[PDB]
Amino acid sequence: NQALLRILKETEFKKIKVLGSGAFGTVYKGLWIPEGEKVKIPVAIKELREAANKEILDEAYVMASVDNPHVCRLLGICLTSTVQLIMQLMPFGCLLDYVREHKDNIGSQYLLNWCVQIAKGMNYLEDRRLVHRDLAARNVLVKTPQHVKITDFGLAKLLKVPIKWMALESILHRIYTHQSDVWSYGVTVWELMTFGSKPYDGIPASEISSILEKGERLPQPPICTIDVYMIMVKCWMIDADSRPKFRELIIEFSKMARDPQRYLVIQGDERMHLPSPTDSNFYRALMDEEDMDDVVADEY
Amino acid sequence: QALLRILKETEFKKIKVLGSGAFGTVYKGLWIPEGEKVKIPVAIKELREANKEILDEAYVMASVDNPHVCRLLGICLTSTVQLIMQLMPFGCLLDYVREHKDNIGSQYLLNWCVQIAKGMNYLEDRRLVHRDLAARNVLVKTPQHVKITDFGLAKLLKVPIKWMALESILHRIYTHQSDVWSYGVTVWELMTFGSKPYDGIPASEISSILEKGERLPQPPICTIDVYMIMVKCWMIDADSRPKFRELIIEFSKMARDPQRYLVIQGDERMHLPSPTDSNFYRALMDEEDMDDVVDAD
Amino acid sequence: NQALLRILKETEFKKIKVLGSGAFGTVYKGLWIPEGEKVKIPVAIKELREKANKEILDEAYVMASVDNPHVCRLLGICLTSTVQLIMQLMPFGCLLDYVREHKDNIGSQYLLNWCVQIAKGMNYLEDRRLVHRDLAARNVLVKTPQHVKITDFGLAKLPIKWMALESILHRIYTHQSDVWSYGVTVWELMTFGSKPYDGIPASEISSILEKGERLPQPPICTIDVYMIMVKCWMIDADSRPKFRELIIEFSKMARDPQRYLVIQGDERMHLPSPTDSNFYRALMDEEDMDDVVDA
Amino acid sequence: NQALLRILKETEFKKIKVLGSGAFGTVYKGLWIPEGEKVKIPVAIKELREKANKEILDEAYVMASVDNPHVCRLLGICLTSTVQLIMQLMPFGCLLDYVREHKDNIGSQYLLNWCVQIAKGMNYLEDRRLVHRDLAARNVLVKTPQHVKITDFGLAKLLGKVPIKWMALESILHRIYTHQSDVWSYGVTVWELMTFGSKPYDGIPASEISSILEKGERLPQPPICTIDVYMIMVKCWMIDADSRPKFRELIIEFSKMARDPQRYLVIQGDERMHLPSPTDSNFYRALMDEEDMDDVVDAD
Ligand SMILES: */C=C/C(=O)N1CCC[C@@H](n2nc(-c3ccc(OCc4cccc(C)n4)c(Cl)c3)c3c(N)ncnc32)C1
Ligand SMILES: */C=C/C(=O)N1CCC[C@@H](n2nc(-c3ccc(OCc4cccc(C)n4)c(Cl)c3)c3c(N)ncnc32)C1
Ligand SMILES: */C=C\C(=O)N1CCC[C@@H](n2nc(-c3ccc(OCc4cccc(C)n4)c(Cl)c3)c3c(N)ncnc32)C1
Ligand SMILES: */C=C\C(=O)N1CCC[C@@H](n2nc(-c3ccc(OCc4cccc(C)n4)c(Cl)c3)c3c(N)ncnc32)C1
């Protein structure tokens, strides 16, 4: 439908503060003040740095379309010297910032659930036949810690290359496929379990293709179980078809979720607490009204 | 005509992504009747890939009227083709057995086998050839009531070489006797709790190996008496393979004494359905008349 | 008589290897050295699980007594703290084991022939009017692919799945009972060494026969072959075919092996030529015997 | 026989290297000097951690009495405050290590055969009435690529962390050891070989494992392992020992598979890697393997 995307007047919105920056565009926290109304509402706006707008509009129209709990939805667009994108605002920000910040605090149960939601969100993309082209811990967002959602997908299509994230087929031949996405998906999984460290740190981007060919893959994190790592390792496979399909990642991660403590070894995991039903429910009402699949602990 | 309903894209929506099938992508769905507040859960299959041709094939599928054959409720025609049928929460038997694999009854497994044959047999009666039959293609309306699906879908339009008969493989010949051979693979899938036949072996190799006689392994649970039935299905000469109609009786007889035929760890601990339990499932889950489940005599 | 059975001092023979463990006794590969002889000649020795020694000897004397192609004759007994039985070594060894190994590569003709061969041996035991009490595919030894010899017959002084209902119910052993034990043995061959009543507890065995739920019929087996097995297992001993009948039926069956037993790709795999077979007899089967039936 | 095993004076032999360490002992590569001879012969020395000396000799006498192609025999022992065990030294050493090194290029025909060979060695142990109590690939030596033998059997009884992952549940829970339990270890042994030396129940604490085995978890199908082979492993891991397969049955089942190895295991470039020619095998026999051994199953 063209119902999904809303055309926003520059008069309609103003940008109060800068949340973040991305290679594609700067981002803001914004107020949308409705025509004919008194109130001012918080929203997140990103304006592209460089910019066939009608061609883009066709792209945005799809971006608006997606309907998954774990996938971000593009509410609106504004066209000017610089294109403006309007979407829901996430206070928590990306997972990457969230995990790095919470490294001492974080516990086994959450990390796996996040992995599952990404798979769910990503799986929707595959069925929709959409290629994100950029899955990274940064790209994913937290509506709330329990609920996380994928984002910034198709932007490359809308319009500075992350070699360390990219799959070998991607690096060598500029080939992007859902399976390529897994390699990134694996990289993202590596990202969380490292609690925000940066892959292939200090290594020249140019050198990267050779190392993958050499088979010197990213090391497995101390917290990470070999069972979990092997899963990561599988994602990083030279042949894309060989790499696990998205569904499998959804199924396997969840099983771990049923028994989170055994798979991931985290200091003081037992002591740190997953949210109580009271804790999750409160968060849901205030922010997460949208009905999303209940998170799996199964042990507790 | 009366049997199959032609929907309007306005009429329903695929809300939840469901499953991946080589034949199709399956979506949980909601049906909104005009003038009505209510929404009805449906299963939607979207087919990857002549409008008239489907209708002839489609009408027959709407046609099937057996407890153990799923019927196609509606067809919606568009750049892509969507097949409407009732939603089964349990979905694949293959999914169900593997998920519940550690624990299952002898009684259930034989009963499914009996249930599958009754359905396959009916298709046989109707002169419908499945071409492709598998555990994956059989889904659970309810635990005691699995139903056979995707029948004849294969014929109309990745090939299941491991499932297929040698006669089917060698010259792409499909017959009811060819189906029977598949049934053993389906019977075999369950007794192994969801395993894969000729697992991981190349398809190219398989046609040669069947000739070599290197048949599927006997499952640990399986009694020889059960394994022999499968072996008969996989006989190279099609005609020699037992008819489903025979197949129904043998499993039904076995179901009378489930423990003697199939060996299970802690089966006694595991519970056959309570009569009360069976009735409760019927009331909400299953409202369709069907033959009664076999119970130990 | 005195001549038939040799009593050997422990000195005469030394065991070398454990081929297998019998339920009744352990079995070894042992070497026999003749007095003042450089040569060591291979034999197989059985040590009983472990009465009166004299009584046992009488039983051995009977066991020595049998001379038949399809029955095994005990050459030697050693009397000591533990009884030892010596009989000629067979490299193929167990019949039951042989089928399991060769199920993929085995021809139709051989299976029928073995059925005929056992039946004649069981029949000799019958004429002598001695009852085996324990016929098993395990207890038949392959002298050569074309020859088999039943053994472990008698051993009364010293299995439910094999055992006949009458024997199981009342500890009754009769020739008719031996036919029932024989019926299982055919199944084992046809099954290619399938374990009968696999996974089923022994306690269940008495009732199911009472129920009447039999051993299943093997895929290779023709309808005709299976029925013979079924006749053999019957509630009333008398109804079950005599061995002579079984010998006659099978041999008739052996004349046209293909019709009775259906084996995939049967034609390609065949019984060896007389020229080959002659080689087998001379090297191993020096013994006077019936030649194998040919279609 | 007394002759079979020889007591040795300290003076005759020395430990020139420490090859490896084991739960029982430290294994040293040592040379043996015969009196009045100018040359040294390589042997393998194992020293115990540290039961009267006479008591030990009786167990030891048994160890040196075992003649089988696939079961290792002990040449000599030295009585001391420490106890030293001497046996032939094989350059390939551990079978388990061999599999790890050779993952890149191990032929299908070999892997099935080692199973025949380990089983053959195991059956003899059963016939002899000896229960190994700690069978693992680690405990299987490689005399030659074609020929591998079983070692370290019966060592376990003398000592007083157990190898829990290998152990049958009966052993874990009630310290019960039987041939049937032994099959379970053999089953694990098959798993290690098939998976090219990967650790069993890796990353999982010992305490959980007895609990997990009851739950019904069993080690995963090796990626290169066909379903037929996996079932065989699975039976071994049965709770009811008696249902669990006997070795002779085990020997028979692998031999059939050996006839058509490619059918029962899938390895990349299995066609490329083929069993060594008779000329190649014959060469090996004479140089390091004079002793007679049972014929290898050949697919041809
Ligand atoms: C295959 C069944 C099994 O487990 N076996 C254990 C040893 C290997 C096989 N086997 N057994 C003998 C064998 C059988 C019987 C023997 O004497 C008993 C006996 C009873 C009644 C009459 C007579 C004359 N003997 C002996 Cl001594 C040995 C085997 C022989 N002899 N050769 C190869 N394999 C044998 C059965
Ligand atoms: C491979 C695991 C490991 O780390 N090892 C350390 C050295 C390399 C391997 N290995 N062990 C021996 C070995 C084993 C046992 C030995 O004597 C004990 C013993 C017990 C039971 C029977 C017998 C005959 N011996 C000795 Cl002395 C040595 C190796 C030998 N001998 N050669 C190469 N590698 C060996 C294990
Ligand atoms: C790691 C990212 C980070 O640290 N940021 C700083 C805080 C704000 C973060 N952020 N980005 C967006 C955001 C993302 C994407 C947006 O439009 C792109 C897009 C692409 C495809 C589909 C859709 C629906 N949108 C926009 Cl407009 C904004 C944030 C939002 N929206 N809210 C809160 N933080 C956001 C980046
Ligand atoms: C185990 C197979 C698998 O991976 N699946 C994906 C998950 C969902 C599973 N599943 N499939 C259907 C299903 C099957 C077939 C369907 O239509 C085909 C068809 C054609 C003609 C006639 C009939 C009767 N059917 C449809 Cl529409 C749906 C599921 C259903 N229906 N419910 C739950 N799970 C289902 C298979």
Numbering used by the authors:
A (entry chain H): 700 to 750, 755 to 862, 875 to 1011, 1013 to 1016
B (entry chain E): 701 to 749, 755 to 862, 875 to 1014
C (entry chain C): 700 to 749, 754 to 861, 877 to 1013
D (entry chain A): 700 to 749, 754 to 863, 875 to 1014
Would you copy out the relevant sentences from the publication that reported this structure?
In consideration of these limitations, we developed a novel highly potent EGFR inhibitor CHMFL-EGFR-26 which selectively inhibits EGFR oncogenic mutations including L858R, del19 and L858R/T790M. As expected, the crystal structure showed that the acrylamide of CHMFL-EGFR-26 formed a covalent bond with Cys797 of EGFR. The aminopyrimidine formed two hydrogen bonds with Met793 and Gln791 in the hinge binding area. The Met790 oriented in parallel with the cholorophenol moiety and formed a beneficial hydrophobic interaction. Furthermore, the Cl-atom formed a halogen bond with Leu788 carbonyl which presumably contributed to the high binding affinity. Furthermore, despite of the similar covalent binding via cysteine 797 residues in the EGFR kinase with all other irreversible EGFR kinase inhibitors, CHMFL-EGFR-26 forced the EGFR kinase to adopt a distinct “DFG-in-cHelix-out” inactive conformation, which is rarely observed for the EGFR kinase inhibitors. For all of the sensitive mutants, when C797S mutant was introduced, CHMFL-EGFR-26 lost activity significantly (50-10000 folds) which suggested an irreversible binding mode via cysteine 797 residue. Combining the results that CHMFL-EGFR-26R, which lost its irreversible binding capability, completely lost activity against those sensitive cell lines, these further confirmed that CHMFL-EGFR-26's irreversible binding mode observed in the X-ray crystal structure was biologically relevant. CHMFL-EGFR-26 showed an IC50 of 19nM against EGFR T790M mutant, 71nM against EGFR WT and 215 nM against EGFR L858R mutant.
